Design a protein around this ligand. Structure first.
Ligand SMILES: CC(C)(N)c1cc(NC(=O)[C@H]2CCc3ccc(Oc4ccnc5c4CCC(=O)N5)cc3C2)cc(C(F)(F)F)c1
Ligand SMILES: CC(C)(N)c1cc(NC(=O)[C@H]2CCc3ccc(Oc4ccnc5c4CCC(=O)N5)cc3C2)cc(C(F)(F)F)c1
Lengths: 253, 262
């Protein structure tokens, strides 16, 4: 059992609030992260969503997965993970425009695929992989999670509309691959969210692969296309994705 | 359940090998560390020790505690944990002789204290806390474990971290939260002096006899001068020959988290 004894966790500075939960930095045997539900009485749907997240995270134990540490049901619903120092991959690529070099982008790719493989082996479908959910711990270690509190990462069959599968996550990983090698989001020239949803859903729109860094190895570019295949079945599974990056990582540095 | 699906682990490089198992660098969803038995069929009392280690590791989910990932029985009894790059605190201090900064020395203690506080709360006595069992992953993160043999052996069982009540080897069980504290106090000594205690004595049995009867004690006057007053005071508290005059880990952690921001 992973229930943290009552009255141990001291909540500190308020990080991020969302329509559902709120995150605080806190103290429990050092620095910890705390995702709380700020409600006086939780509904059955809230209670159930809590029990899912906990049920899932307790099955994870891997360097590329955000480390789960415990939960508290009284006084308020809370999930406790390690405290990570750094930013999301989203932040580095699109906000503070960190210029990583090729070797490092590939290491991020590998590590993300490393953890993704882990989740899939245990029948865990992420359902919402995106650069924002990939936290870069100490600007070294990928820690995949759900920092949720959308659309660019959604595969066609998820937009047309349970349509989630191992392959739906690969497409999201494909978009993350795109972000890494371009440094930009897909469809940056289109400024109408509703139209993107329509177009990607019909196959009219695809990420423009021509925008890759000149020094992105061909093997990376070819893997990317495989992951973005509009049809579920054509997309490689993560064991093959990893193998492909691990073959490419070989003859490069 | 944390049994790893049969035959997924590939064992590679060979790191260390006592009589109680062999440590390998392996592969399971990335680079991992593997400790396993190399006998045909394990004895009843070897299977037990395996079951205890797994029993303990399964209860730990902490940044400063070495990350247990899974175990396997077929083909062999094996424990899988995360792979760590770098070397123990012992190596850095007494073999390669890294000249760490004071801020970092305090951080190294702050983390070991964090880790120990966690284990003690989960009702886990370490029983062999020493700078050999303090791994410095990527030279910036303390991972506490029992690396018996996966790291270099200490100068002299290892004796330097044992409290007086532990060395006297009384038939009644002497291991307590405080004995871990004393070991921490010796680790602190190691950090603050860059040296091992009782370095001017060359007889193992003398050291044993004298620490036990309280005729020997670490020489406090050996510490760096840029070492805080609040640290020396604490390090003396942790080494107090009286068992329960030694601060428990929550109070230790608070004291280090105090001066850390001044
Ligand atoms: C519901 C389901 C099945 N889709 C699902 C939920 C999650 N949920 C999480 O990962 C949550 C857990 C609670 C929690 C708490 C604190 C938190 O915020 C941290 C953590 C560490 N460091 C920092 C911050 C804040 C911002 C900073 O600066 N540091 C983040 C999270 C993330 C994971 C998975 C996965 F394992 F499959 F990926 C799957
Ligand atoms: C039985 C009991 C209660 N005394 C006990 C045993 C342990 N046992 C461990 O920690 C073992 C587990 C198996 C294992 C396997 C591989 C290994 O070698 C690693 C690991 C990581 N990285 C590296 C290496 C090699 C050298 C390098 O370069 N990297 C180390 C260990 C350490 C922990 C605890 C504690 F956590 F409570 F303190 C308590």
């Amino acid at each position: 059992d992973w229930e943290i004894p009552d009255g141990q966790i001291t909540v500190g500075q308020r990080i991020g609030s969302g329509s559902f939960g709120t995150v605080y930095k806190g103290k429990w045997h050092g620095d910890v992260a705390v995702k709380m539900l700020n409600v006086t009485a939780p509904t059955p749907q809230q209670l159930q969503a809590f029990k899912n997240e906990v049920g899932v995270l307790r099955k994870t134990r891997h360097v590329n997965i955000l480390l789960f540490m415990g939960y508290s049901t009284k006084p308020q619903l809370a999930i406790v993970t390690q405290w990570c120092e750094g930013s999301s991959l989203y932040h580095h690529l699109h906000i503070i425009e960190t210029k990583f070099e090729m070797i490092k982008l590939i290491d991020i790719a590998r590590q993300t695929a490393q953890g993704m493989d882990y989740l899939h082996a245990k029948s865990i479908i992420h359902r919402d992989l995106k650069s924002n959910n990939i936290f870069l711990h100490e600007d070294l270690t990928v820690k995949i999670g759900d920092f949720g509190l959308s659309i660019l990462w959604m595969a066609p069959e998820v937009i047309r509309m349970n349509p989630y599968s191992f392959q739906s996550d690969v497409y999201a990983f494909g978009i993350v691959l795109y972000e890494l090698m371009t440094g930009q989001l897909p469809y940056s020239n289109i400024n109408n969210r509703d139209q993107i949803i329509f177009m990607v859903g019909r196959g009219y729109l695809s990420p423009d692969l021509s925008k890759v860094r000149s020094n992105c190895p061909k093997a990376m570019k070819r893997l990317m296309a495989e992951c973005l295949k509009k049809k579920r079945d054509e997309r490689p599974l993560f064991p093959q994705i990893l193998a492909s990056i691990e073959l490419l990582a070989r003859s490069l540095p």
